[PDB]
Amino acid sequence: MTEYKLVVVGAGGVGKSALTIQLIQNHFVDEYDPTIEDSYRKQVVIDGETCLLDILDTAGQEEYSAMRDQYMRTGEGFLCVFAINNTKSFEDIHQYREQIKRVKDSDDVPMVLVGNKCDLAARTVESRQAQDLARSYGIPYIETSAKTRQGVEDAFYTLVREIRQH
Amino acid sequence: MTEYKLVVVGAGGVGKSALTIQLIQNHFVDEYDPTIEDSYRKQVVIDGETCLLDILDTAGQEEYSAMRDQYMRTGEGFLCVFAINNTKSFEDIHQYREQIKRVKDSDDVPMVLVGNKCDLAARTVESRQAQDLARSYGIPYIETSAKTRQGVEDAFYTLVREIRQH
Ligand SMILES: Nc1nc2c(ncn2[C@@H]2O[C@H](COP(=O)(O)OP(=O)(O)NP(=O)(O)O)[C@@H](O)[C@H]2O)c(=O)[nH]1
Numbered sequence: 117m118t119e120y121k122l123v124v125v126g127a128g129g130v131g132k133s134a135l136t137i138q139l140i141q142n143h144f145v146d147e148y149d150p151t152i153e154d155s156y157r158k159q160v161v162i163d164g165e166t167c168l169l170d171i172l173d174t175a176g177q178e179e180y181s182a183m184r185d186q187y188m189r190t191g192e193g194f195l196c197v198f199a200i201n202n203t204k205s206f207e208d209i210h211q212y213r214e215q216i217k218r219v220k221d222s223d224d225v226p227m228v229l230v231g232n233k234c235d236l237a238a239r240t241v242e243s244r245q246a247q248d249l250a251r252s253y254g255i256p257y258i259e260t261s262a263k264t265r266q267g268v269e270d271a272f273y274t275l276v277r278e279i280r281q282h
Numbered sequence: 283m284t285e286y287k288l289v290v291v292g293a294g295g296v297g298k299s300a301l302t303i304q305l306i307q308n309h310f311v312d313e314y315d316p317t318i319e320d321s322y323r324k325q326v327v328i329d330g331e332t333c334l335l336d337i338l339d340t341a342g343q344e345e346y347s348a349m350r351d352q353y354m355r356t357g358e359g360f361l362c363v364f365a366i367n368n369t370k371s372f373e374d375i376h377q378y379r380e381q382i383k384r385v386k387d388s389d390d391v392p393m394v395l396v397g398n399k400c401d402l403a404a405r406t407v408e409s410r411q412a413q414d415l416a417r418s419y420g421i422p423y424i425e426t427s428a429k430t431r432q433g434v435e436d437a438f439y440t441l442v443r444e445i446r447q448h
Pocket residue numbers: 126127128129130131132133134135145146147148149150151152174175176177232233234235236260261262263264
């Protein structure tokens with residue numbers, strides 16, 4: 117069957133693991149548990165197509181650095197995740213974007229910009245500024261909450277549809 | 283606030299009204315009630331943007347004909363709906379597509395192809411053939427059921443994101 121190799125990237129603590137576990141296992145994890153590298157494989161049906169989601173959940177820390185090159189080369193699409201209450205994670209998106217473009221030798225890679233933790237009232241990144249950034253990259257912007265499950269299937273399925281139209 | 287002028291088109295009986303009422307009023311209508319023309323206006327928040335959805339629900343019958351030109355000219359994005367158990371509704375998509383391109387003087391209009399009634403086991407249009415058609419148009423393909431609410435928010439919100447990136 118068709119397999120889609122998705123990679124979730126972004127700064128430490130933005131909720132990359134919580135979004136992936138909400139999608140795969142249907143629950144919100146709320147504890148401190150830094151990722152090294154986890155993969156999840158799940159057979160699903162998306163718009164009637166039977167497929168397998170092979171998802172790589174990555175570390176937010178640069179002990180990795182050029183160690184990111186390997187997984188970026190094999191990833192077909194990327195969720196670029198920041199937290200709406202963390203301005204530094206939003207500014208860090210530019211560095212993941214440029215690294216992915218450089219390892220894949222391409223200016224248009226299937227990618228979705230995801231603003232997570234949208235359940236929080238202490239917002240520091242306005243949706244309008246993230247939407248402007250996404251518009252300049254030519255990619256979709258989706259807001260999510262791994263805590264309420266808002267936007268979670270939407271972010272992953274929009275990324276599968278982006279790979280489909282590449 | 284930002285307003286998005288969406289138009290739902292497709293052959294008679296494919297579920298254009300049932301998809302729109304599931305989104306606006308949260309229930310599945312199951313009765314015979316042919317549309318002449320209905321509009322629905324709803325303030326919503328999509329990816330943190332406060333906006334108003336102005337949705338026009340149209341007639342599946344050609345007593346309309348060139349009477350479609352007016353609403354197609356004012357629509358910013360279109361959901362093109364067929365039913366997965368009705369082959370003629372699928373083939374009719376080409377005629378709505380070409381009319382919209384002709385009235386808007388454009389080869390790329392914000393549009394989503396929606397295969398509705400995906401809860402039914404008596405399928406006559408394979409997802410793969412609809413996905414191929416959507417790929418040739420350069421637009422997203424989404425399967426929906428107004429009966430279970432699967433895919434309903436996804437189809438309308440993907441169309442708002444398509445207007446956003448035009
Ligand atoms: N309120 C709220 N908290 C969230 C959300 N997503 C994640 N969190 C919380 O934020 C913390 C970090 O989440 P985690 O998934 O571990 O982040 P990560 O990006 O995977 N971290 P790392 O890069 O080190 O692997 C946890 O306490 C988690 O519960 C969300 O949508 N809402």
